[PDB]
Amino acid sequence: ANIKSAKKRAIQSEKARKHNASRRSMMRTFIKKVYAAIEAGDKAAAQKAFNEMQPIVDRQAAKGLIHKNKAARHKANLTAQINKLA
Amino acid sequence: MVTIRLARHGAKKRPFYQVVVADSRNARNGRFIERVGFFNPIASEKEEGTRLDLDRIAHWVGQGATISDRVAALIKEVNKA
Amino acid sequence: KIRTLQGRVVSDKMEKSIVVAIERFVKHPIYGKFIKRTTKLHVHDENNECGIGDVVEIRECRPLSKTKSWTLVRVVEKA
Amino acid sequence: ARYLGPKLKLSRREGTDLFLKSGVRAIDTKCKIEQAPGQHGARKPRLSDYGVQLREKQKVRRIYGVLERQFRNYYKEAARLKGNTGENLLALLEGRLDNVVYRMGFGATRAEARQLVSHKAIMVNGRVVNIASYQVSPNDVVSIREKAKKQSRVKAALELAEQREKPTWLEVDAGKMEGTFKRKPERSDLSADINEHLIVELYSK
RNA sequence: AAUUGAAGAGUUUGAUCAUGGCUCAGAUUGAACGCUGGCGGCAGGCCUAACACAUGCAAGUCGAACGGUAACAGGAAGAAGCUUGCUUCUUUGCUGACGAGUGGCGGACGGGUGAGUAAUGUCUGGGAAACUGCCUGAUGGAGGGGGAUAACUACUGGAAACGGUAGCUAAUACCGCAUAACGUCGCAAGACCAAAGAGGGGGCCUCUUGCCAUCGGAUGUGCCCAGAUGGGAUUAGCUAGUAGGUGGGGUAACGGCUCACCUAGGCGACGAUCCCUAGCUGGUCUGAGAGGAUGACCAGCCACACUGGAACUGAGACACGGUCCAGACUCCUACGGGAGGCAGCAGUGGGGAAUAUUGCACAAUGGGCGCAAGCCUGAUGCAGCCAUGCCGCGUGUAUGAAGAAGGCCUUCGGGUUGUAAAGUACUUUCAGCGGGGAGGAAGGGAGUAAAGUUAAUACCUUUGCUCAUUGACGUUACCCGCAGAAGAAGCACCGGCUAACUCCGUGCCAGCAGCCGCGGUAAUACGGAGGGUGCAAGCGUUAAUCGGAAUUACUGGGCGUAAAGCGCACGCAGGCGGUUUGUUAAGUCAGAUGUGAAAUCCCCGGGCUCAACCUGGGAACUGCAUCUGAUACUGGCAAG
Ligand SMILES: [Mg+2]
Ligand SMILES: [Mg+2]
Ligand SMILES: [Mg+2]
Ligand SMILES: [Mg+2]
Ligand SMILES: [Mg+2]
Ligand SMILES: [Mg+2]
Ligand SMILES: [Mg+2]
Ligand SMILES: [Mg+2]
Ligand SMILES: [Mg+2]
Ligand SMILES: [Mg+2]
Ligand SMILES: [Mg+2]
Ligand SMILES: [Mg+2]
Ligand SMILES: [Mg+2]
Ligand SMILES: [Mg+2]
Ligand SMILES: [Mg+2]
Ligand SMILES: [Mg+2]
Ligand SMILES: [Mg+2]
Ligand SMILES: [Mg+2]
Ligand SMILES: [Mg+2]
Ligand SMILES: [Mg+2]
Ligand SMILES: [Mg+2]
Ligand SMILES: [Mg+2]
Ligand SMILES: [Mg+2]
Ligand SMILES: [Mg+2]
Ligand SMILES: [Mg+2]
Ligand SMILES: [Mg+2]
Ligand SMILES: [Mg+2]
Ligand SMILES: [Mg+2]
């Protein structure tokens, strides 16, 4: 970088990339837990995983990591899959 | 945001300003939404050197548009400062 | 009203889809002769109602597939 | 940007008095007005139709002292203006400030009127105008500036204009050295010897 | 008022009429070149190498988010020569401030270029499944905690660039918890989701501002469809995520966007695929128009940023002066490894027929940040250079016969250059020199008084009122004086087309030439001169476009013999369709509504002394869509 603000921006966006990647990995892990429970056939475990995931996707949407439409999509998809199970 | 400012037209040493409503990110003489008047800083006597569509200006203002300092002074002067 | 188009079904071999030839009568920009021109549209046919040769009324909708943005309204006159 | 050469050559080529001298003497006593200039002047080789049109255009240009680009612009304006194009062209030429200064009798010739205009001796409506091609409009007042009222040129020119047909579309006061442009001249007010349709045809080719 | 609009000529022949090509007269340009060159105004100026780039500058800002204190400029606590005034002190984040750092916002704009792109583009008109920083309306919230981390300190690695380790510390940085609907998921019951402070003043209060949520506005952006938008058929077949469906995933959002499975489709002579070329538009040039040509400047859209690729951050980028990788090239190196991207503005080299200054200023307009002051701004305003264009003006004006001298021609009389010189009498624009002197400076800063706010005459906010001030251009425009015709004319042409004619020089030579042609001793055609013609601070030449060319003919042409009827026929697609009534209302026609950016063109006005230029209203944008009517004609349908 040649410009001072551009060097500072590079540092800041690297910091943010690490922070965001940690949060995004965590949220994807919880979503994957819900999907794994759905695949196993366990509704009760599926609902438990969903109740773990729901506040996480809501909060990550509130923080701007994902759009609230994406959080709504995950919630709707998993709820429809869980309900159609028994 | 939407601003009401002066686009600089006319000729060299002889400016003529069009009062435009524009997205402020556009170039001074570029893309604008609506022209709402003009200001001639060198208009002669008996010549109308300022005309402003105050109704359109108030419509855009009550809709979020900001006003540049020169245009605000012109609006005050159309009302006899 | 609702904006619609009317045309001839030229293929119904797709599941829930048809191809409609829309015809327009336009003046030639140079010679002034009125000539016939065709527009072909992939149209959504839920229930697979349409056959090759029917005349259908269609309307524009959101994209439904890569080439489909029109849906069946009704068969004005059957084949 | 001005023709500075001998004057009567132009008249002799056009075969008529262009009034390029003050008119104290007859143009016969100053040149062989009936003979075109140069070694082969006495000859009179047939003129083509193009030659006739060209000579008419040149004669009007030389009467008013207008070069070709300005004259062409005059033709374009006359064609644009509503009405008869040739009459419009003559009216535009008559509207020139140097020509009006000559027609009021402030200048002995159009070139002297042009110098009076250029050298800031002329006022239109109380304001100095030193542009020779300035278009005078009806009800305008053209005056000699106070600093220039003592010039012998101007007194002599007014004397000379006393001995010409007075234009009716103007109103001059030789005492105050003021004149008024009442109206644009009509074609009847101008010479019947000018055949402006030839100029219009020339430029329409 | 805004469509006042249309010219031919030369050349085939012994001659003619026709046909037909070639050529010329016009207008134009981002021009170049040759000859020449005074001033000003306004505009324009790398068309080639999207070649390579030395150097400077083109993006910062905020202390009213934060720890702080490098520096200063001081207010304090403590300090040496020797001018009784005084430095010099030394310390102190106390204060104004402020280097470096955290944080916020900006850096996605502005500016450049036209490589790619023949359709993810552009233009016109429709549309639905979306997001949107700053601005703005409404309603509420704005509690209570926590763990860090730069900076800094100590050590340490490397030549450098750049790092490593450990220990301190802050917030409007970060993270839980609480709270939680008119938000999200859900049929419902329910379940779940946020936040930040900071400044001014005051006998904790109040004001300002910021923070969070939701629903609106506005603006911007993403997406979809129809029509339009180059050439080539000596490119005719192209396509397997291909076309469609179902389900999962994915996106802000619809969608083969993606994947699995199923169906076997989809495109194409109304030109798919392939090949060549190309940014598109408003417009520009030309034209009577219809057209043709074109897309420089200005404005809208798009694409690109050394080449190829990628994502990250972010409201927004797959990011000109950000990141990562790879490549070519240039450079530094201690040989281990590092650094860089002018198609920002200047500028250099180079390529070229050819295209400018390494300027001044943020005064104005606008943009970023800031509560402001202000800081930044190669945007922009200006200035420099260039006759590149357009416009304006000057280079004198009278008078002057001696029709002088010379030149040139001569029939030797004279003719002409000629009122042209000279002489005489005047005028001084512009240039030069002196003085005077607008307007682009709106604001902003201080006080002041009212409100209008409060516990408050305070802070703050609106108004007025006073003060002092703000111009890069700039020796501004402009005006007034001074001296004197002085400081200011060239270029092409003169056989016909085509305005303009003769002498000497030459002898099919030298040479000219757009076409026809000219030159071989008596050349208006070559060369010089005298004379003349046309343009004129330019004039010619070349290039290039349209015109003339009705010579691709839609307007607006032909085919017996000039070029041109398939050898003849049948016939699908296609084009066309006798007559009457009804119906329809697609074509068509009428009205209206929306849209058709601004600029440009045109008409009317207005401002620069005029003009060019600038500019106010109109007209126009001949289009498209929708709605409502008409029904003669054409089309559909029904009956004849
Ligand atoms: Mg689609
Ligand atoms: Mg000129
Ligand atoms: Mg925060
Ligand atoms: Mg909570
Ligand atoms: Mg290209
Ligand atoms: Mg024509
Ligand atoms: Mg084109
Ligand atoms: Mg992101
Ligand atoms: Mg950038
Ligand atoms: Mg750069
Ligand atoms: Mg440059
Ligand atoms: Mg060179
Ligand atoms: Mg700077
Ligand atoms: Mg001033
Ligand atoms: Mg002739
Ligand atoms: Mg001879
Ligand atoms: Mg033609
Ligand atoms: Mg023919
Ligand atoms: Mg024959
Ligand atoms: Mg034949
Ligand atoms: Mg036959
Ligand atoms: Mg037959
Ligand atoms: Mg019929
Ligand atoms: Mg109709
Ligand atoms: Mg327009
Ligand atoms: Mg005027
Ligand atoms: Mg106008
Ligand atoms: Mg009928």
Automatic annotation (TrEMBL), chain A:
GO biological process: ribosomal small subunit assembly; translation
UniProt entry tagged with the keyword Lipid biosynthesis: no
Keyword RNA-binding part of the UniProt annotation: yes
Gene3D superfamilies hit by this protein: Ribosomal protein S20 (1.20.58.110)
GO CC list: cytosolic small ribosomal subunit
Molecular function GO terms recorded: small ribosomal subunit rRNA binding; structural constituent of ribosome
Entry superkingdom: Bacteria
Region (Disordered): 1-25
Keywords: Ribonucleoprotein, Ribosomal protein, RNA-binding, rRNA-binding
HAMAP family with a match to the protein in the record: Ribosomal_bS20 (MF_00500)
Annotated function: Binds directly to 16S ribosomal RNA.
Similarity annotation: Belongs to the bacterial ribosomal protein bS20 family.
Protein name: Small ribosomal subunit protein bS20
Organism: Escherichia coli
Gene that specifies this protein: rpsT
TrEMBL record, chain B:
Gene3D superfamilies noted in UniProt: 3.30.1320.10
The keyword Ribosomal protein is annotated on this UniProt entry: yes
Any one Gene Ontology BP term: translation
Keywords (A to Z) from UniProt: Ribonucleoprotein, Ribosomal protein
InterPro entries: Ribosomal_bS16 (IPR000307), Ribosomal_bS16_CS (IPR020592), Ribosomal_bS16_dom_sf (IPR023803)
Spans through the membrane: none
This protein's GO CC annotations: cytosolic small ribosomal subunit
Gene Ontology MF terms in the entry: structural constituent of ribosome
Highest taxon, organism lineage: Bacteria
Similarity section: Belongs to the bacterial ribosomal protein bS16 family.
HAMAP family listed in its UniProt record: Ribosomal_bS16
Protein name stated in the entry: Small ribosomal subunit protein bS16
Protein source organism: Escherichia coli
